[PDB]
């Protein structure tokens, strides 16, 4: 496992409370990590380009990002790694903005220690990750429209004019709505 | 939207939600983005519009510039920033 760690400043949203130098330095020294870098805005195009270049050059097979909550940008970094050849499920997310930096402003030292611990946990999880091929399922090209008012009539006509076969279910004997 | 700090009625950060869409636009295979440009002529009709656009000279190569900002740090001339709506300053190169 060759783990590459990427700590996001997010401008001053993590950086202002957490020392994105001390946290990157620990990540470089943690077992199995072959690169540790920090960028101002990783979710942006330059940051994704940096991650892809690092994967291509250093041959990273595990990617860890110390950034905002995974519920926000996990898909973003997942499609980033793939365009650079890595499997999507080899990537890990450490939440150091919503969980550490925005809730411990009055304790910068405790915030930095918590960020270190969270990145350590993220790398520990990432060590044991394995590739998983995701299965595609077909999408039926049919639509159902519930309600026969002006909005439902408009939606049904727009879908039908775009070529899709549409069903329109209306509880009243006639359409029109209010 | 990019100039707002938060948005009503949720007081959520405007840029935090707008920036991903901007990145998506900037890296979409089906989108050709032409900034700093203006539509000059439109001729024809539906399905058959011929549009002539003029891309104004940035004096910066879009393909080469990485937006690092060193030129901004080194520039000696100050000028208003349009993004700051007349209360913020930047350099001649910005």
């Amino acid at each position: 496992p060759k783990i590459g760690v990427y700590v996001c400043h997010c401008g001053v949203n993590i950086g202002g409370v957490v020392d994105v130098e001390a946290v990157r330095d620990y990540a470089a020294k943690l077992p199995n990590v072959v690169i540790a870098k920090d960028y101002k805005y990783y979710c942006s195009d330059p940051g994704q380009l940096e991650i892809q270049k690092d994967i291509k050059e250093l041959g990273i097979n595990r990617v860890v990002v110390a950034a905002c909550s995974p519920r926000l940008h996990e898909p973003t970094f997942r499609r980033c790694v793939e365009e650079a050849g890595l499997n999507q499920f080899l990537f890990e997310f450490a939440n150091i903005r919503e969980h550490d930096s925005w809730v411990h402003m009055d304790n910068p030292e405790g915030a930095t220690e918590k960020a270190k611990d969270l990145v350590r946990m993220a790398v520990a999880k990432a060590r044991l990750l394995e590739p998983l091929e995701a299965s595609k399922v077909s999408v039926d090209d049919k639509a159902l429209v519930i309600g026969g008012g002006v909005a439902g009539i408009q939606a049904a006509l727009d879908l039908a004019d775009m070529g899709f076969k549409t069903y329109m279910v209306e509880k009243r004997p006639s359409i029109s709505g209010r | 939207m990019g100039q707002l700090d938060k948005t009503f009625p949720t007081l959520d950060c405007s840029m935090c939600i707008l920036a991903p869409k901007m990145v998506d636009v900037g890296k979409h295979d089906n989108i050709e983005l032409i900034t700093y440009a203006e539509v000059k002529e439109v001729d024809g009709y539906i399905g058959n519009f011929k549009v002539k656009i003029e891309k104004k000279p940035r004096y910066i190569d879009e393909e080469l510039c990485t937006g690092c900002g060193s030129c901004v740090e080194v520039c000696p001339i100050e000028m208003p920033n349009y993004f700051d709506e007349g209360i913020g300053m930047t350099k001649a190169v910005y």
């Binding site: 727009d158 004019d161 775009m162 070529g163 | 539906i46 399905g47």
Partner: peptide, 11 residues
């Protein structure tokens, strides 16, 4: 959607 309808139809 409204602009796509004519382009989907193609004529």
């Amino acid at each position: 959607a409204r602009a796509a309808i004519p382009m989907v139809k193609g004529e």
